[PDB]
Design a protein around this ligand. Structure first.
Ligand SMILES: O=C(O)[C@@H](CO)O[C@H]1O[C@H](CO)[C@@H](O)[C@H](O)[C@@H]1O
Ligand SMILES: O=C(O)[C@@H](CO)O[C@H]1O[C@H](CO)[C@@H](O)[C@H](O)[C@@H]1O
Ligand SMILES: [Mg+2]
Ligand SMILES: [Mg+2]
Lengths: 253, 253
């Protein structure tokens, strides 16, 4: 079994804390179950949470592996080897400029905003916003509701793909949590361990995640995507419930 | 006679060129008629256009006078004396955070944007955008068309004022082109010369300018406000006609 999990609103709360999920995560580790973050966050953000590779960043845009991963792939970067799946940021920002001209109105993203503004909009510290701005593949957009559809089609018009991370729309191309997961499983050292995958998420950008796993669990608010398991409570309480009710009993085998 | 004039859309075309207004300006200067810019632009932008004081920046937020001005007012700053009429930008920005909390939606201004983003939205070069970002009083807002009214209501509810400069809304407190023109006329070294004021402009933020002068001329598009002259063509072509057909005859008598 491998557990692929979203971070904010799934494994972490609004404080960015594990809360009730901490005990659940410790139990999975005690049982030798790999837990792989699959997140909209940048590498810098993931590193700041103290998370170790392997992990998936920017909605599936990049797959980070330990420098010494048994199965060769990617490019050496310090204590990392990196695999790229989606288009590069500065190029995405280029299609956005094209979409802007098509839509006849500004389309703003994190790239257009100062760290101070990003911090204000997200409630992060300035340092944390600097990390959130350090994007390699995916752009986080700051759209107003009425233009949303207008902008989204304009995005779709110029061949960009969009998703929604729970609070913000994102623009990218080739960045897909399900695609990233599929690739990581294909690159797993122990094919037997990767044979059964679990996916936990809370937002639209986790739909691809759910479709790439064998047991999907939705811990978001409202109704879960079709066929996906739900939990009585959202977020970390959901994570904990999912581990206790759904995962632990299967591992007793 | 003092000629108070807006810059963009009045004296300058959409490319920032004088166009047909150049000979008109030269004629005024050759005849010793003071021409005083009264603009939404910052002091840095005005300087980059090669304009010497006196001039009025940021929608009336500040009056910049030659330091050797015979009527000592305001405070010395390098080669100028500055009369501050409006809240400082830092105070406006802080109050904008409150309007934003009230509105429940981001309210972005130039202060939130990179020079690169401001350049893109205005068609300015990056260097020009840096100058437009160097604001001392007034904030330029970048609002969703659909959110404008809610935002303007929020600004007012938290004690800020707003205007529109032709393309963008602005937020400030105490910046008014009319108040600024009145103050400058009151500070003029030669009261006789200040007794008759001409005002030329093209946008909402110029309506106070028209009220503060004795001969008002609108060179924007569509019909002029009540009590304000129109010209056959808008922009610098209107400035030229105004100088040739309205001002130079007044002067000759
Ligand atoms: O998509 C969103 O709604 C959130 C949650 O996934 O992610 C964005 O916003 C987060 C902060 O709220 C950042 O940490 C991420 O990098 C990203 O920019
Ligand atoms: O208000 C507007 O519609 C324009 C018209 O001059 O002024 C803003 O926009 C201009 C660029 O278009 C800047 O030069 C000014 O500083 C200001 O930010
Ligand atoms: Mg999430
Ligand atoms: Mg104008």
């Amino acid at each position: 079994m491998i557990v692929f999990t979203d971070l904010d609103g799934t494994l972490l709360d609004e404080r960015g804390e594990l809360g009730p999920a901490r005990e659940a995560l410790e139990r999975l580790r005690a049982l030798g179950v790999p837990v792989v973050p699959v997140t909209a966050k940048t590498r810098k953000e993931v590193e700041a949470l103290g998370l170790e590779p392997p992990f998936i960043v920017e909605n599936g845009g990049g797959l980070y592996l330990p420098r010494d991963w048994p199965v060769r792939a990617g490019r050496p970067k310090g204590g990392y080897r990196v695999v790229s799946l989606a288009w590069p940021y500065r190029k995405v920002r280029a299609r956005l400029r094209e979409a802007e001209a098509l839509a006849g109105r500004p389309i703003l993203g994190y790239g257009d905003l100062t760290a101070e503004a990003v911090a204000r909009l997200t409630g992060l510290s300035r340092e944390a916003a600097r990390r959130a701005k350090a994007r390699e593949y995916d752009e986080t957009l700051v759209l107003c509701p009425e233009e949303v559809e207008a902008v989204l089609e304009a995005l779709e018009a110029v061949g960009l793909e969009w998703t929604h991370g729970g609070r913000f729309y994102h623009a990218a191309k080739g960045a897909d949590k399900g695609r990233a997961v599929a690739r990581l499983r294909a690159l797993w050292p122990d094919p037997e361990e990767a044979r059964f995958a679990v996916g936990l998420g809370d937002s639209l950008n986790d739909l691809p995640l759910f479709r790439a796993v064998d047991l999907a669990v939705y811990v978001g608010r409202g109704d879960p995507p079709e066929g996906v398991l739900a939990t009585p409570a959202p977020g970390p309480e959901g994570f904990r419930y999912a581990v206790e009710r759904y995962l632990l009993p299967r591992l007793s085998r």
